[PDB]
C-alpha cells in the first residue's frame, strides 16, 4: 500500500510546519527542546543525503528539500533568532549519549554493510530516540508553552498511519523490515510518553 505512507509523511510534514509556524508568529520557542530539533534535523540530513545526487521527481526533490528547510529553519529560530526565549537551562540532555550509541548500533545491526545502507540505518535509529531530549525537558518543568494540541495530533497521526502501513504490507505483500519496525515501535512508544506527559503535566 502507498496511501498510508503518503498521508503519514504528509502528517509528519504538517507537524514540522505547525511547530515552525507557531515559533515564528509567537516570537518565542519556550518549552521547545532545541536538542531534539537538532537531532531531527540530523535525521533528515542523513536520510535525504541523496538530494544533492540522484534526481527522481519534482515531488521527490521538493519533499526532501521541504523537510530539510523546515527543520533547519526551526533550528535557526531557536538558537539564533529567538534565542532569548530558549530555555537552555532546562534542555540539558547530553545528546552525545544518543548519537554515539546510535552510530555504533548502525554499524553493528543492519541489513547490509554498505555506506548507503549504514547511513539509512543511522537515520532510522536516530529518529526513534530523537524526542528524548524533549521528554526530559517536559518531565523536568511540566510546561511546553509552544507545544500545541494540533502539533501533537499530527505527530500522532504520523505514527498511526505508519503502524497501519507496517500491518498492511506484511499481510497483503509479505514485506516486513524488522529494523524499521523495531525502531518504529520504539519511536511510537516514546511519542506516546510525550503525549502522556503533555496531558498530565502541562494540561495540569
Amino acid at each position: 500500500m502507498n496511501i498510508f505512507r503518503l498521508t503519514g509523511d504528509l502528517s509528519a510534514l504538517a507537524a514540522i510546519i505547525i511547530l515552525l509556524l507557531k515559533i515564528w508568529k509567537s516570537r518565542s520557542c519556550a518549552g521547545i527542546s532545541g536538542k531534539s530539533q537538532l537531532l531531527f534535523a540530523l535525521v533528515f540530513t542523513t536520510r535525504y543525503l541523496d538530494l544533492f545526487t540522484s534526481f527522481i521527481s519534482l515531488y521527490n526533490t521538493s519533499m526532501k528539500l521541504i523537510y530539510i528547510a523546515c527543520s533547519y529553519a526551526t533550528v535557526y529560530l531557536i538558537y539564533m533568532k529567538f534565542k532569548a526565549t530558549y530555555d537552555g537551562n532546562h534542555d540539558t540532555f547530553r545528546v552525545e549519549f544518543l548519537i554515539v550509541p546510535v552510530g555504533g548500533l548502525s554499524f553493528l545491526v543492519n541489513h547490509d554493510f554498505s555506506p548507503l545502507e549504514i547511513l539509512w540505518t543511522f537515520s532510522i535509529y536516530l529518529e526513534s530516540v530523537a524526542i528524548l531530549p524533549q521528554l526530559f525537558m517536559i518531565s523536568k518543568t511540566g510546561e511546553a508553552e509552544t507545544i500545541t494540541t494540533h502539533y501533537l495530533f499530527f505527530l500522532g497521526l504520523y505514527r498511526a498511519l505508519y503502524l497501519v502501513n507496517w500491518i498492511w504490507r506484511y499481510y497483503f505483500e509479505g514485506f516486513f523490515d524488522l529494523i524499521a519496525v523495531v525502531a518504529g515501535v520504539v519511536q511510537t512508544v516514546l511519542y506516546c510518553d510525550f503525549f502522556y506527559l503533555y496531558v498530565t503535566k502541562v494540561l495540569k
Partner: nanobody
C-alpha cells in the same frame, strides 16, 4: 520508466520443479523490493515470496515454505523464483512486482505481464 518481464512458465507434472525469472529494465533506484504474486483461476491474487535489493532477508508464504526459494542477480537486473516439488494447486499466472523502498517514491510501482504456470496432477 521501468519494465519488468517474467519468463520460465509453462506446463509441468506434479512433483516437478520450475524456475521463473523477472528481468528488470529502465532506471534503477538504490533500495527496492521484489515480490512474486500468483492468481489461480477465480481466486484473488496472493503474494508468494519476497526479497530486497541487498541482504539475506527472504520471505515465503505459508503454502510455499520449504518448496520455494527466491534469489537475486543485480548484474543482469533479474530476480529468480526456484519452484521445487510442485503441486497442482500451484497452477496460476505468476506476477513479479518491484517497489521503490526510498522515501517519497510512492508512485514507483511496477508489475510484469505475467507468465502461465500449469501443474498437471
Amino acid at each position: 520508466q521501468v519494465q519488468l518481464v517474467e519468463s520460465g512458465g509453462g506446463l509441468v507434472q506434479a512433483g516437478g520443479s520450475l524456475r521463473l525469472s523477472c528481468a528488470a529494465s529502465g532506471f534503477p533506484v538504490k533500495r527496492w523490493s521484489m515480490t512474486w504474486y500468483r492468481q489461480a483461476p477465480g481466486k484473488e491474487r496472493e503474494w508468494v515470496a519476497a526479497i530486497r535489493s541487498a541482504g539475506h532477508w527472504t520471505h515465503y508464504a505459508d503454502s510455499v515454505k520449504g518448496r520455494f526459494t527466491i534469489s537475486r542477480d543485480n548484474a543482469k537486473n533479474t530476480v529468480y523464483l526456484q519452484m521445487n516439488s510442485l503441486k497442482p494447486e500451484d497452477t496460476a499466472v505468476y506476477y513479479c512486482n518491484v517497489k521503490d523502498e526510498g522515501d517519497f517514491s510512492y508512485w514507483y510501482d511496477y508489475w510484469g505481464q505475467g507468465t502461465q504456470v500449469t501443474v498437471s496432477a
